C-alpha cells in the first residue's frame, strides 16, 4: 500500500519526532522536501494545508496538519498510545512535559546569537532540576522497563529522542539519572530505533548556518 | 465518585478551557484556589505536581498535570473526542489550530503595553485570514450544526470559547462569518453551556491589574 508522505524542509524542526515515531513503529515513509518559499506557497494554494502551515503528513487518505494531530494518529494506529484512557492520561502527561523541554531545545538554534548562552542555561536548569528527576521518579516508582503499562509506548520514543538532543547540548546532564541511561540503551537497542540511529537513515542533523537561513527564506521569518 | 478537583489561581489562565469542557459535559467540580506563592510551594512539596506546575486536576485517582493531558482525558471520558481514530484526527487538527490562536490571546495580557499593540494586530490578522476561514470552510462543506460528525464534540466547545475571547478583543472579526456566528448562538443555548454562561458560575473574567499582579507573585515569572 501507500507510504505516509511527510511535507517539510530538509531539517529537524517540528517534523522530527514524527519521523522517529514512524521509524520506531517500523513504518516506511516518503519525504517531499520544501526547498523554497514557492514550494510552500504551492502547497497553500492547492488547499493541502488547513492552517496554511506545515508539517503536513499524507496518511490514509488524510491531509493531516498540526504536529500533535499527526503524532496522536500515528501512535494510535501502531499501538504506541497505551491500552486504555487512564494509560493515555499518564502518557499524555509525560509527553507534554517532554514537549515542553523539547520546545525549549527546538527554539534554541533560532535564538539571537548572543541570547543563546542564557537560553541554554535555562535548558540545563530545567533538565537537571525538573524533567529528568520527574522521569527518573516514574521509573524508580514502579520498577518497570518502560514508562507506562510495562510496555513500549510513544512516551518511551519521545523521551529518548530528547535524551539524544540533551547529550548533544550537555553530555553531563544525564549522568546522575541511571534509569534514564538504562532506558536510553534499551530503546536504542530496539531493531527499528537502532536502525534509525545508524547512518543513512532519515534521521536529521542539528541546525547549521546553511539550513537556518534556508528556513528563514522558506517560512518567511 | 469524588468531584474532579481543580488546582489553580482565580484566573482564566490555562485552566479556563478545562472549566468550559467540564461544564459543557455536565460535570460538577471543585476548585481549590491558589492565593499565594506559598500555596504553590505546598503542592510542590507534597509531590502533587509532576513538573512543579499547574493546571493540575485530581480526577479518577490521578493527579493530572498538563492542560492537554487533562483536556484529552475529559474529552474521552465524556465522549466528546470522536467515534474513532480518524475522527479524533479531525478534532485534534481543529483544536490545535484553535489552541494556537487561543495561545496568542492567552499571552497578550501578560505581554507589557509596549508589545500589546503588535501582539493584538497579529491576533487580528490571523483570526480574519487564517483560522476563521478554516472553520467557516468546515461548516460550509457539510452544512451541519456541528464541526465533526453532526454531533457535539470538544471542538465546538473550544471554538465557541474562542469566539467569546475574540469578541472581547475585537467584536468585528466574526462579522463576515455567518456560520461561525450561528455556531456561537447554538452552542451558547445548549443547557449546560447556557448555565455555564450564567451569572454566578465558575467562569472567569479577563485579566486586570490586580489579577496580573497576583499572577506575578504566585508564579514568580
Ligand atoms: N501549530 C504548529 C504549526 C507549525 C508551525 O509553526 N508552522 C511553521 C513551520 S515550523 C510554518 O509552516 N510557518 C508558516 C506560518 O506560520 O506562517 C504545530 O504544532 O505544528
Ligand atoms: N505545560 C503547561 C504548564 C503551564 C505553566 O506554564 N504553568 C505555570 C502557570 S499556568 C506555572 O505553574 N508556573 C510555575 C513554573 O513553571 O515554575 C500546561 O499545560 O500545564
Curated annotation (Swiss-Prot), chains A, B:
Q: How does it assemble?
A: Homodimer or heterodimer of GSTA1 and GSTA2.
The enzyme class is transferase
Q: Which residues form the GST N-terminal domain?
A: 2-82
Its name, as the record gives it, is: Glutathione S-transferase A2
Q: Where is this region: Disordered?
A: 198-221
Q: Which function does this protein serve?
A: Catalyzes the conjugation of glutathione to a large variety of electrophilic compounds.
Gene3D superfamilies in the record, alphabetically? 1.20.1050.10, Glutaredoxin
Q: Which reaction does it catalyse?
A: RX + glutathione = an S-substituted glutathione + a halide anion + H(+)
User: Residues in domain GST C-terminal?
Assistant: 84-206
Q: Which residues carry this modification: N6-succinyllysine?
A: 3
Specify where it is mainly localized: cytoplasm
Q: Which cysteines are joined by disulfide bonds?
A: none
User: Which keywords label this protein?
Assistant: Acetylation, Cytoplasm, Transferase
Annotated glutathione binding sites: 8, 44, 53-54, 66-67
Q: Where is the composition biased (Basic and acidic residues)?
A: 205-221
Amino acid at each position: 500500500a501507500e507510504k505516509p508522505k511527510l511535507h517539510y524542509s530538509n531539517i529537524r524542526g517540528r517534523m522530527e519526532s514524527i519521523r522517529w515515531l514512524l521509524a520506531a513503529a517500523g513504518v516506511e515513509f516518503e519525504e517531499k522536501f520544501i526547498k523554497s518559499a514557492e514550494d510552500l506557497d504551492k502547497l497553500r494554494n492547492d488547499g493541502y494545508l488547513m492552517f496554511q502551515q506545515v508539517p503536513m503528513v499524507e496518511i490514509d487518505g488524510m491531509k493531516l496538519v498540526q504536529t500533535r494531530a499527526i503524532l496522536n494518529y500515528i501512535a494510535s494506529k501502531y499501538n504506541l498510545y497505551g491500552k486504555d484512557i487512564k494509560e493515555k492520561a499518564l502518557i499524555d502527561m509525560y509527553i507534554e512535559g517532554i514537549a515542553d523541554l523539547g520546545e525549549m531545545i527546538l527554539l534554541l538554534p533560532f535564538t539571537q546569537p548572543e541570547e543563546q548562552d542564557a537560553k541554554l542555561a535555562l535548558i540545563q536548569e530545567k533538565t537537571k532540576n525538573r524533567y529528568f528527576p520527574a522521569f527518573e521518579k516514574v521509573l524508580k516508582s514502579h520498577g518497570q522497563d518502560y514508562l507506562v503499562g510495562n510496555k513500549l509506548s510513544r512516551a518511551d520514543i519521545h523521551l529518548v529522542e530528547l535524551l539524544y538532543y540533551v547529550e548533544e547540548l550537555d553530555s553531563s546532564l544525564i549522568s546522575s539519572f541511571p534509569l534514564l541511561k538504562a532506558l536510553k540503551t534499551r530503546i536504542s537497542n530496539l531493531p527499528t530505533v537502532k536502525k534509525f540511529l545508524q547512518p543513512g537513515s532519515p534521521r536529521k542533523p542539528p541546525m547549521d548556518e546553511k539550513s537556518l537561513e534556508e528556513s528563514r527564506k522558506i517560512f518567511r521569518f
